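The freezer alarm interrupted the setup, so I double-checked each line after restarting. Inputs confirmed:
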Amino acid sequence: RIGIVGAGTAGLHLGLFLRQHDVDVTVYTDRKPDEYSGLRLLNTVAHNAVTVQREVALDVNEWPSEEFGYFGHYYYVGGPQPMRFYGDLKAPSRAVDYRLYQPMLMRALEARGGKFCYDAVSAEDLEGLSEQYDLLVVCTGKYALGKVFEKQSENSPFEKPQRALCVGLFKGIKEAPIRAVTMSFSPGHGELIEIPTLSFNGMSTALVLENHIGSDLEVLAHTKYDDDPRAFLDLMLEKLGKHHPSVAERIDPAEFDLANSSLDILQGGVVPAFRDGHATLNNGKTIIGLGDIQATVDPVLGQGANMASYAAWILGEEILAHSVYDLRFSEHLERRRQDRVLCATRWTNFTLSALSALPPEFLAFLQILSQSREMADEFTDNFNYPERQWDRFSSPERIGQWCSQFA
Amino acid sequence: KRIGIVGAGTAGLHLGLFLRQHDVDVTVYTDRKPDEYSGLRLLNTVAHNAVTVQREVALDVNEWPSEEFGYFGHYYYVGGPQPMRFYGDLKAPSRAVDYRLYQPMLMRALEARGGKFCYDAVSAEDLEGLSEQYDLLVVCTGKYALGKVFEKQSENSPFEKPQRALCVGLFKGIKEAPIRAVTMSFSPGHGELIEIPTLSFNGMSTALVLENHIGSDLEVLAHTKYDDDPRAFLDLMLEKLGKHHPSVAERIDPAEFDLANSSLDILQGGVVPAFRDGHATLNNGKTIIGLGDIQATVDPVLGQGANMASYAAWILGEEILAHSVYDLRFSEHLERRRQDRVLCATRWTNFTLSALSALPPEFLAFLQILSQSREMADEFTDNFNYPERQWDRFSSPERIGQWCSQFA
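Predicted 3D structure, all chains:
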């Protein structure tokens, strides 16, 4: 009845939802559940409280957020006079290695009647699959399926990576007084997101290094661990030492290494893109884009996974409520999902550009944020709601209005 | 009595398995667990010949019998206006199994036999400390720049950059030849293709080892990415194979032709051939032994790498039992036993690489006689098991001519 091209958080959450309402689902993915452990580190993004609520509703709360998650954000922002402050999440967020998490979802879906076809799907296959199901949904960007959905230029200002990425899971990093993410900014050099992450060997810490192009931190995206582990580790230690010291001071150098293996490191760049939420094929049938295919987001704000889960839930509801899946159905869908998903893109793109250029109104925001606990709490919890973050950041007047609410 | 092995692979695990049979203490240092192999990008697609499977049988690690999963000869194709098509038998079957299935099988066998694993990445700085923890430390991984510890032998290393732009992948949709066999296809001045019947996740598949000449009509296959556009890559592949390697291309079903399991079934790049000292003396005065890829990095064109790794592991294994002091004299005993075959594999591969691009008169004359004599083709094919015998033939033009004269 419903065909899903691609597993991942979007496809599996959609499949699990539809399966609760006795809808026939088939998922097309290339990797078997028992073949995930050896994959290179996937999307290191955390799942927020709202996504966790969906997991509870979908009966896939394998690793509870209160036991395995984190409860707020520590903030570090560097320079000659560094700022150190904290904001609470109202309910815990949680990061679990996707190499453990995705197979869990796949096994839960299969056990509940969801069918799996373990085969690689490319653009040429889409027309044939569209005639096999009432609706075809594609949520994976791999095998170049992203090219099927037209790029929206008005929502895609960047054409190349804005940061040089070095993302890894590490051992030997002590936990802060409270289990929390640390967001560290080295002015003109880079961002670090430290995320407590459950992986193979237990609780480790993810280091998401969003390094500026041409900065003192860019080398970390180009130096290979497998070329010389000691040299990589030494370089990491000194770079964190001077750029992200609030994280660095909790590192034990004797224990500092990757959490499991050299597979726990991912280096490169992400081109942010916002695309059409639907595509019309040659046979006249409409297919629906979900998750990464509709929006490729830079991981700095950790929005990707939460947007995938959110849109999957809405699309699931809309599949039940409608019987004709055409342009009108597509309109209904976008009306419900677009704002939050688009705002996650807009808030991420704004933040990347604001961090590099450092505009007057943004610097004034960082100052009031550091000096107001109540503002830090609100800003932190609003990571769960990117639409209301864009309500704050969309204009200099809105930034100023929000700042005046506190001091 | 107590041996430390840096790196797994065929070299490390064969050595480990050998030593455990004689109840010596074995520890292997690797950064990959057995259950992590299935999700890896494509590894070395080299086949194991009859002498290697013989060692595998002796090590009770013959998981995939040569009869059901192996191949029985080589088809040879040489391109041109009048192509050469000929065949040579192997006396005993060779076998290629995806290393992402084969390596964990070795690891599980070694684990179950008392072999210990320390799952860690080893840096050059760690070697001195590790050498003081074991009676002998052996390195066999080419990772972590550990090769730099073993002095490069310039007289045995004529190349300093990759001689070929590589595109290697596991493919479905390629029909088997009348006999289950490797095909070695040569497009004059453009590239070599080694088609290997290989057991992978979904059963029997076919490896395509495309060794493309730099500046040719085939170099583009090593640079165009499958993930950018799968259809464009496969169409390009079908176009290039149809032109340059038609004997393989004729057996391809274009409707099914794709990577065997996933996008991870493809490797592109290059190999820098090198031959290094088989030993190194550290600052603490202790001798460490080099094994497999770290002492000899070979181009995959003749598929010698894995066989040499297995061969040297057996020799080193035997010498470890025969000696109690592991120094320079021990190293001499090892080198005099293992060197000729391992060195001749390097020499023969390098000679072949240069001869295929330059095409000397004595090489073309050899090709002519080989294509018309099955007995010579059979001898040449089976001698893939014996690199030293191949170098007895190819080391000089006089030796090539003598071999041609006894078959003409």
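Quick read of the result. The radius of gyration of chain A is 21 Å.
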